Amino acid sequence: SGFRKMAFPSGKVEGCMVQVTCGTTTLNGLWLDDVVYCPRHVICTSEDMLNPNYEDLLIRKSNHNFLVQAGNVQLRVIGHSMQNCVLKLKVDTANPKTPKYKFVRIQPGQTFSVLACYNGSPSGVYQCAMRPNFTIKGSFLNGSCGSVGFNIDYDCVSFCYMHHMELPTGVHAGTDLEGNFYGPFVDRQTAQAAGTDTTITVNVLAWLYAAVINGDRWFLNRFTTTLNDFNLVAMKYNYEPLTQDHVDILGPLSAQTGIAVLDMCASLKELLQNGMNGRTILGSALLEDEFTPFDVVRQCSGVT
């Protein structure tokens, strides 16, 4: 029993973190095989970030200008290239700690773990979700750029995020491991505002199923609803519209608890309309939306 915001074990990713310095800018890099992946703004001075022309800035850079340090040992850079908003630094040594890995571009609503790093050294690990407005609500200070987001399937690490920026509103933006930003964000020190941060409806329902499995059942009511009726309520409360695909993915949780998905939708509907009334669900006074149905199943079964 017990339900926690759990991150994947970080060891496999800790063994990939390196420090990358270019001129006077230092950030984190991800060392996989003989390549180090890092944000391309490593080549910028804070002054260049106001309006950078990365291709032009990169012309003035040679392999020897990119200092890559893994622990206290220096890696030799033998090639460099820009792929979208990331730099790929070919080093002469393959990372002996390279795990089995994939690069995946996740969809909003999907969750992942972040290994926050400073100077190639890990500080902590926490669980995030790609918000529907393509930002993440992380915890990143200066020096954290290049810290990565990932998921793990048995022994394979699927890297999904690389940290690049903090918007003026304290929220975070970044790319997948191909250098493509999630959302409309650009690696530039300019006014970039996020869109509406809607609640990930499928995740709240999954978390309500986790609450039932763990004993919290006060919110279960005698009602049911339809997808269209539920969605009218979800629109009013800035919740993502629920689709039949979302219903299908909640199937195993519905089967385990014996509570039909549309009945849980009705419970969620009353929670939105009436509030918690000072009560809690899994030690939270708000509806948690950063557990996918897959995360609930994983945590409630014991997948390692």
Ligand X SMILES: *[C@]1(O)C(=O)Nc2c(C(=O)OC)cc(Br)cc21
Instruction: Decide: is 110 part of the binding site for ligand X (CB under 6 A).
Output: no
Query: Do residues 53 and 41 lie in contact, with contact meaning Cβ atoms separated by under 8 Å?
Result: no
Q: Is the Cα dihedral 174, 177, 181, 182 positive or negative? A: negative
Q: Where are the beta strands (DSSP E) in 48-178?
A: 66-70, 73-75, 77-83, 86-91, 100-103, 111-118, 121-129, 148-153, 156-166, 172-175
- Structure-token match 């050294």, residue found: 121
Stretch of 111-119, 222-230, 253-261, 266-274 lying at the interface with a copy of itself (CB under 8 A) = 111-119
Q: How far is the CB of 74 from ligand X (least distance, A)?
A: 20
In the complex, minimum distance from the CB of residue 62 to a copy of itself, in angstroms, rounded to a whole number: 29
46 binds, among ligand X, a copy of itself, none (CB under 5 to 8 A by kind): ligand X
Q: Which stretch binds ligand X (CB under 6 A): 143-151, 170-178, 223-231, 295-303?
A: 143-151
Name which of ligand X, a copy of itself, none residue 200 binds, using a CB cut-off of 5 to 8 Å depending on partner kind.
none
Of the candidates 110, 111, 135, 144, which one interacts with ligand X according to CB under 6 A?
A: 144
Pairing of strands 100-103, 121-129: unpaired
Candidates 127, 189, 224, 284; binder of ligand X (CB under 6 A) is 189
Residue 169 touching ligand X (CB under 6 A): no
Beta carbons of 120 and 136 less than 8 angstroms apart: no
Q: Is 130 in the site for a copy of itself (CB under 8 A)?
A: no
x-marked contacts with a copy of itself along 199-218 as a string, rule CB under 8 A:
---------------xx---
Please say if 80 is a catalytic residue.
Answer: no
Residue of 144, 151, 231, 267 interacting with a copy of itself (CB under 8 A):
144
As a whole number of angstroms, the distance between CA 164 and CA 52 comes to 14
> Under a CB-based contact definition with an 8 Å cutoff, are residues 113 and 209 in contact?
no
Of 41, 163, 164, 246, the catalytic one is 41
| Stretch in the footprint of ligand X (CB under 6 A) among 52-60, 142-150, 173-181, 190-198 | 142-150
Is position 41 annotated as part of the catalytic site? yes
Site string for a copy of itself, 164-183 (x = CB under 8 A): --x---xxx-----------
Size of the site for ligand X (CB under 6 A): 11
CA–CA separation, 18 vs 37, rounded Å? 10
Burial per residue of 91-115, b for 16 or more beta-carbon CB atoms within 10 angstroms, e otherwise: beeebeebbebeebebebbbbbbbb
Check binding of 256 to ligand X (CB under 6 A): no
Which does residue 171 bind out of ligand X, a copy of itself, none, counting CB within 5 to 8 angstroms by kind?
a copy of itself
Q: Which of 29, 109, 138, 293 binds a copy of itself (CB under 8 A)?
A: 138
Burial 32-63 (b: 16+ CB within 10 A, else e): bebbbbbbbbbbbeeebeeebebeebbeebee
In the set 16, 117, 145, 160, the catalytic residue is: 145
In the structure encoding, which two tokens stand for residue 155, read together? Answer: 């022994």
Q: Which of 29, 109, 143, 183 binds ligand X (CB under 6 A)?
A: 143
Helix (H, G, I), strand (E, B) or coil at 94: coil
Half-sphere exposure of 235 (CA within 13 A, CB side): 7
Query: Could you tell me the maximum CA-CA distance found in the chain, to the nearest angstrom?
Result: 68
**Residue 222, both tokens:** 């005698």
Active site residues: 41, 145
Q: List residues binding a copy of itself (CB under 8 A).
A: 1-12, 14-15, 115-119, 121-126, 137-144, 166, 170-172, 214-215, 275-276, 278, 280, 283-286, 298-304
